[PDB]
Amino acid sequence: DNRIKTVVILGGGTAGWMTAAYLGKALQNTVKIVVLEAPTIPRIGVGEATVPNLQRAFFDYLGIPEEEWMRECNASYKMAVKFINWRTPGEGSPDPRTLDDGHTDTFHHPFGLLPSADQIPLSHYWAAKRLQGETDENFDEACFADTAIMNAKKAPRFLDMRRATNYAWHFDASKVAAFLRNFAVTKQAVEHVEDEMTEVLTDERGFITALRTKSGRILQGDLFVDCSGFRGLLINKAMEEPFIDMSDHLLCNSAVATAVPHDDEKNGVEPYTSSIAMEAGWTWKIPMLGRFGSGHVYSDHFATQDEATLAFSKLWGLDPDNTEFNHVRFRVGRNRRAWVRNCVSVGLASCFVEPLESSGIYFIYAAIHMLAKHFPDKTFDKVLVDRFNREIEEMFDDTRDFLQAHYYFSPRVDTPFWRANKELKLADSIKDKVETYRAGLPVNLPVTDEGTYYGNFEAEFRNFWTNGSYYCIFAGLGLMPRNPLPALAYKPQSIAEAELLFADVKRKGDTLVESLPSTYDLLRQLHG
Amino acid sequence: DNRIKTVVILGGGTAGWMTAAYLGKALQNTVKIVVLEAPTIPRIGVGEATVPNLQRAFFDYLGIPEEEWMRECNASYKMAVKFINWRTPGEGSPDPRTLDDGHTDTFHHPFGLLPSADQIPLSHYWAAKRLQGETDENFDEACFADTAIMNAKKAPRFLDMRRATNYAWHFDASKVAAFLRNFAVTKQAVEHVEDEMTEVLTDERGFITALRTKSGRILQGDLFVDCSGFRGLLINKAMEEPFIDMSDHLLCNSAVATAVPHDDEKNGVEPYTSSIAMEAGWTWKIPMLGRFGSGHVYSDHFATQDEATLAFSKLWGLDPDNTEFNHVRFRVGRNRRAWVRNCVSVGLASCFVEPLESSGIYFIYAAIHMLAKHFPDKTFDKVLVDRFNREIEEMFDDTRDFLQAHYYFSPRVDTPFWRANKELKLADSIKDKVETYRAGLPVNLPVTDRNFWTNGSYYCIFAGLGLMPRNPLPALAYKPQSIAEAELLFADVKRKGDTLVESLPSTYDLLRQLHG
Ligand SMILES: c1ccc2c3c([nH]c2c1)CNCC3
Ligand SMILES: c1ccc2c3c([nH]c2c1)CNCC3
Ligand SMILES: c1ccc2c3c([nH]c2c1)CNCC3
Ligand SMILES: c1ccc2c3c([nH]c2c1)CNCC3
Ligand code: NA
Ligand code: NA
């Protein structure tokens, strides 16, 4: 029996306790699991956003019903990221300015998949009409019924919990961590050691054999998961694996955040995450029951912490002298290798981007999914480790490129921050995709229906940012194809068939805006 | 109005008439379509095999029901390619030799999809048992109920046409061409010009402007599709686009073929294509109603045309002096670019590999599908042309790699041909996949009920030829519940196979019903 017998996970929070719970289930009680978590001072809950596959890929795999965990972490509902003021100059404001053409400066990035007609996505029929002046509708409203639902702040489910649309989740991350920690300890025999690490003990080859705690106890193991966050106490410090800084792709490096109490009854609750453009970055807004998490992501090359905190406070009309703020400086990039020897990095210790498209928890899940799939024995076959690393680096770089596109193709040039983003070099892959897009061709066309896509892990991981997402962002920001897809000029029936699709989207949106409960009401029912 | 107005297609046969029929439909009568087809000497019908998505990708787009076209080309059913004697030395024989482990030297590459347990394909559970000495079943018999159905030569559908398994088709290519030509002419307003091309007229920019015929008629056009076959009269000759020879990946370059009458009543009809290994290549067998097509594919570096013809005759006990044979020498590879200026190559004029995995017609309809989607206007946007070319080259090279795997990993070393295959260099992408396979990892895992040769297909060939992972997927060592669930899957395959061998009609009977 040459199997891993003990897995030691350094660090708790979402990364550590998601790893523990997942491997507990994946490894079917054949492996001892230890979490070594420093006890810490509970931070204000600044809110986390997610993508639709979370319930299916993670909580369902563990057999945790959606409502059970949502009730334990003040969870609310997410149908998109909504971008505000990414095209127009000015101070940060929660309220959208107006474009030169009269439109409001908002655009949505929802989760559905576009319908097609004659094997051509709805996006392309919309672009032909917009380019030809046959419509004044925005891409998001024309192509996703969810746009209308969001505009009216209606829920993604009916009150009897019948599904109306695709959605994901907002939640308090520390509450989810605490919930998973309770799950793993009581239901899965995880040992929790509440202590600090003082030593990393290694054999002649540099493989970790044990961790010493501050109390003297030695925790032996065969596989070590670094969930220590940005410090990367195992992968970067002990194992000396270099972190590739990628601030030459994404400039932001700091965040100031808080939770803001919120009059839900008065204002309603938005079923979406908002990315509010600022002078030196952007501010998230993540509605939960009674409060929203908010954080201003910024480059400290272009704004001082005091500057950013003042602008962030002004956004919400906060007293900066009488408000509880969390400040963080982040590294942007990834390790040269995510897994070295018998040390697997997961979460912040592995890689990070600003949460502009809710990447964080997905990255954690994808890594632990891939770890379970590439799980070694004590011979640590190099190919298993290499293939895992390959998946992590491709996953990360692809999302990195995608986020850069948000900044590079913003028309804003009103502050040195927004100007500086256009001095950065675009990755080859996004240059290629823009070329494809500008000729009227689809980018990363979906090959699966929506059920398969969000229901099969590999279907989404292998096609993560689809054609619809590129259209949401490019068109949202005002970047259009140079011309329509030339094939459309030869296909009058197909154009006619797309008109019916456009009309189906209108009818569904109108019906659901009329019949759906408010997000607020669905939340009140759910959380008692 | 900068639209293409006229499309001229050089060449008929399957490539030309599939192109014409497809664009007829895709372009919705907004474009004139002309086919310039040399009248030719009807060759003996040596048979073509296909892959399952022919009906969905091609005939369904045209709205032609499967039975309508099958009846018009003597079509039969294909559930796999069955490889015979690819592991054992000797002269060519239709009968399988015997392996060291007692199994017959046959293995199947069927179209079904493997079930999974705990997100791990059945293949990996099978491999774990075989590596640990817990089973002596072959991969195909353990993992595909279709293997049992094929062994009993049963049909993939019942007599009331309920589907039982995935399948594809065998047919007479000239009959399919003739059927599509009639379709395209009568139903899609395609003009058929029966004449020989004498000149290809080009402007100052190197764009084709017209073809002159031997009768004097000038055929003007805006976009030209080269379906002229291996000669590539437009893409290679007129446009001067270089052909990339890839005989340094696949050694075979010639074929001798015929049709063989067949006693269906006595023998039944096999619902599969057979690849019968020979000393200097291999021989296809493509059963149809009343005859099977057969052709010996060979490298002429290692056997003369006369050598191959004798060995091919010997396989089936033919009189080589009194049998009508067709002889073809092929180019293996692809053009440097499939589409140059206003000339799009489709079919043999674009690219070719030996029909070891029935690639031929797939290459045609994928190209025309891609042409319709990248269809240009008269400005011929460079990006449209480049993106089309990228798809053809990836499609071709990927299938090329897959075919090389069949030869590189044969254990045969009994003739200079089989020895020579191990001197060739493996492409980077196929080396990578072998590395992945050998660690027990899946290759190109299917995400569905882009990814053309999936994990199941790699196992069919690797395991079929005797190449196993170094060890089981290590994760399985931690998953006793998952192994127990896979056992139920294995039992489902036995129970399904047994039930269907008992309830299905023979292929022969289903064919009689269909063609009567
Ligand atoms: C907003 C935030 C994340 C996503 C993802 C999709 N749409 C989004 C919208 C589609 N699949 C990948 C993840
Ligand atoms: C900056 C630094 C860290 C973070 C984290 C989030 N946003 C950040 C911004 C949300 N997920 C948890 C961690
Ligand atoms: C700024 C950016 C991210 C964070 C996180 C906390 N505070 C922050 C401040 C605490 N919860 C987890 C993440
Ligand atoms: C070898 C060379 C050419 C061919 C063709 C088929 N098989 C071949 C084998 C099928 N019909 C069209 C052409
Ligand atoms: Na630049
Ligand atoms: Na000329």
Numbering used by the authors:
A (entry chain A): 2 to 529
B (entry chain B): 2 to 450, 463 to 529
What does the paper say about this structure?
Flavin‐dependent halogenases (FDHs) carry out substrate‐specific and regioselective halogenation reactions in the biosynthesis of various halogenated natural compounds. FDHs are a promising alternative since they are able to halogenate different moieties under mild conditions with high regioselectivity. Here, we show that the tryptophan 6‐halogenase Thal efficiently brominates the tricyclic indole derivative tryptoline (1,2,3,4‐tetrahydro‐β‐carboline) with high regioselectivity. Tryptoline belongs to the group of β‐carbolines, a family of natural and synthetic indole‐containing compounds with broad biological activities, like anticancer, neuropharmacological, or antimalarial.
To gain a better understanding of how Thal achieves regioselective halogenation of non‐native substrates and how the structures can be altered to allow for halogenation of similar or even bulkier substrates, we aimed at solving the structure of Thal in complex with tryptoline by soaking crystals of Thal with a tryptoline‐containing buffer. The structure was solved to a resolution of 2.2 Å, and it revealed the typical crystal packing with two chains per asymmetric unit (data collection and refinement statistics in Table S2). The tryptophan binding site of chain A contained a large and almost planar difference density, while the active site of chain B appeared to be empty. Like in other structures of Thal, the substrate binding loop of chain B is disordered (residues 451–460) due to no ligand being present. After several cycles of refinement and model building, the difference density was interpretable as tryptoline in a unique binding pose. The placed and refined ligand has an occupancy of 67% and is almost completely enveloped in 2mF o ‐DF c (1 σ) density. In addition to the tryptoline in the active site of chain A, both chains showed fortuitous binding of tryptoline at a position where physiologically ring I of the FAD isoalloxazine moiety binds. Nevertheless, the FAD binding loop (amino acids 38–45) adopts an open conformation. The position of the nitrogen of tryptoline's tetrahydropyridine moiety (N2) and the amino group of the tryptophan is almost congruent. When bound to Thal, the catalytically preferred C6 of tryptoline is sterically almost congruent with the C6 of l–Trp and has the shortest distance toward the catalytic amino acids K79 and E358.
